[PDB]
Design a binder for this molecule. Sequence first.
Ligand SMILES: Nc1ncnc2c1ncn2[C@@H]1O[C@H](COP(=O)(O)OP(=O)(O)O)[C@@H](O)[C@H]1O
Ligand SMILES: Nc1ncnc2c1ncn2[C@@H]1O[C@H](COP(=O)(O)OP(=O)(O)O)[C@@H](O)[C@H]1O
Ligand SMILES: [Mg+2]
Lengths: 385, 384
Amino acid sequence: MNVLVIEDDKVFRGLLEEYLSMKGIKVESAERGKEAYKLLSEKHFNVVLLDLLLPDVNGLEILKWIKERSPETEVIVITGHGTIKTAVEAMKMGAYDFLTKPCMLEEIELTINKAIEHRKLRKENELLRREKDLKEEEYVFESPKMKEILEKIKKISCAECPVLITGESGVGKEVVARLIHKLSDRSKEPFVALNVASIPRDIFEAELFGYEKGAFTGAVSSKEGFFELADGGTLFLDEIGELSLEAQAKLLRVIESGKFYRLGGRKEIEVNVRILAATNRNIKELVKEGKFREDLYYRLGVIEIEIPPLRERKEDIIPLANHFLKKFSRKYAKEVEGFTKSAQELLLSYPWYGNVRELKNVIERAVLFSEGKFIDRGELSCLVN
Amino acid sequence: MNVLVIEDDKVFRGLLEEYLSMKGIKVESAERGKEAYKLLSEKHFNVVLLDLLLPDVNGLEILKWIKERSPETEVIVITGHGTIKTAVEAMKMGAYDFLTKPCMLEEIELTINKAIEHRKLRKENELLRREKDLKEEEYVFESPKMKEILEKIKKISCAECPVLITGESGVGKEVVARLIHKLSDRSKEPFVALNVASIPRDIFEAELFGYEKGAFTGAVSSKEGFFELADGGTLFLDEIGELSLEAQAKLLRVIESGKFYRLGGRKEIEVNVRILAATNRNIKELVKEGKFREDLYYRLGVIEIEIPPLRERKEDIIPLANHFLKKFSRKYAKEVEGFTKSAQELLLSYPWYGNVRELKNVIERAVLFSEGKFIDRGELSCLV
Ligand SMILES: Nc1ncnc2c1ncn2[C@@H]1O[C@H](COP(=O)(O)OP(=O)(O)O)[C@@H](O)[C@H]1O
Ligand SMILES: Nc1ncnc2c1ncn2[C@@H]1O[C@H](COP(=O)(O)OP(=O)(O)O)[C@@H](O)[C@H]1O
Ligand SMILES: [Mg+2]
């Protein structure tokens, strides 16, 4: 980490230089504005200690210069006694915190550490989000059945009640839930996808609801749960039919009161989370067999979206295939432009029991083994029909 | 959001209540320490303004109770003028910040906002991190070939120099980069994976190194790149061959001095990032064709690990196949639990030129198609 100190006071300045020097942080100093601007033009800094009062320039201008160029640089303004208004103005202008010249070295340490933590937290947030953005995909709804399902999704998006998405696996259930959140008034809020079937039943509740210290053996400290962390957002539970009966009851409560207890808790907690659920099974049968609460089935089933197989929407097949063609043609550095005229026929003729997920895997393999500029019916031969 | 105000001074408690009101934040009050304790036992507050000087109790006492019970709670301490020393110790115990009774309403706003931002970033990061842990895979390393590579990795992760991972596609080069990271000294630091081919070249250089205003059409601001974001951690560049000659030059310098300039930049940046690269191609070739710099090639290959194809690691095939069947079976709630003997023999005899990725993709489709308890030779034979 690099720090830039812009102070005129040889005393206070040195104190700063020393402190930073002691913590193992690279430092550079500037006695005046013209020198600070020079350095600021040659080196990127993580933290800048700026004194609002400088001989040749008005500190505030430097702060403004810094904030326009690199908002990622934490900036701490330095001001004297009784100059709190400008410090507050400075902060309103983008300064993170401020130091009063003079002050305890402990104040210097705490203020600088607070700024360092913010930066740490800020970078982590950016990285995880940018990493997530890399995986963003664009969807295809060119079939009548889907074209209208899209419209219904637009109508239910801003509702606060739950949606139950059904259909054969690999049909696009999670995709639909993503759009529901994307088109809703919560879109900028978190979207959490949790597959109930793949997460260990014995860990699921602790993760969804969170737990207090000692609620179960192993629980050394207290941990928040997805419901809390996703507060204000949307929670998507895939394969809802695999929820334990114990878990089903707790879920019905949140859907009813938006309140719940952590495992081993006494304080009731409230959250505002839209719940979206999906299943590729027969829940009605699950209710009869007494494995799935009928009440929950009724509530989740208020708004229901049914996604039909790929077989029942051939208008989607080719478009989706082209989408995947391009996608993988990139990921794997290959020269596949499109599909042979006959190859397209095979695609349309196949039943795609795996549906879109199958369609995806097939094209990805076809593209990975592709030699020419096109994919023949023969290249789909070994892969499907 | 729930906040709890614990102030005895009637005027200051009014300001805090007003500000919290202006913001639309649910508020609750206490004038004496013991009243605070009751409320604190009833509700889970997100932020607490705690005055240090209370008639019956000492603020510090409540501070320690909160930091221990619910650490999740942001605590802002209050204190009179010229009493800084008590506030400093307060922060030394877990208090996020402090206010000075009295002060501008704006001062209260800025401080409270910073505490709300701190909580927001904390929870967002915990969430994004946990959504990632959810996608962690268990890795299968049974063959003796992979067994010894695992051993080599261990001796490597303790070094800081770059590593060039080579091997056919779908062989597990990225899986290996991750293990190198987990076993290294920067395991707790970030690991950033980027596939140079999957991203259009123009968008790539900007993303990796960042850019300064004017670097290209519309770049209205200066932006950090993945290199800065991965600082202190590890960066994995897959399909390293697709790097533009310009990108190669910047990478070279970062490997030599940890310094570089953003795209169209003049404000030097310095990072400490371990570099791991992968390729299924022959760099030596690309060098002669003048497509890849020779010096970078040598710097990246200081340590070079070749990950063999599946057909040369037959011991991994059944273990891999079983792992995948189990994984996709749970994912789709299927009743499949294994492969018939005839199925197993096919998996072992098929050459898997697409390697592990091809195996994974084929088992996924087999599970999607299945409706029984086992996958037979017929379901596989049509897939391969
Ligand atoms: N309309 C679509 N447009 C683009 N891709 C889609 C579409 N529908 C599904 N997919 C892709 O097909 C695969 C099946 O996805 P998914 O929604 O998870 O199905 P399901 O939840 O029913 O098992 C995913 O990789 C997804 O990105
Ligand atoms: N040893 C392993 N155990 C379990 N899964 C593996 C293993 N090796 C690779 N995989 C999986 O195989 C696929 C190929 O992955 P990857 O590392 O990206 O290959 P490569 O980088 O060589 O192209 C991935 O989805 C990965 O999770
Ligand atoms: Mg690869």
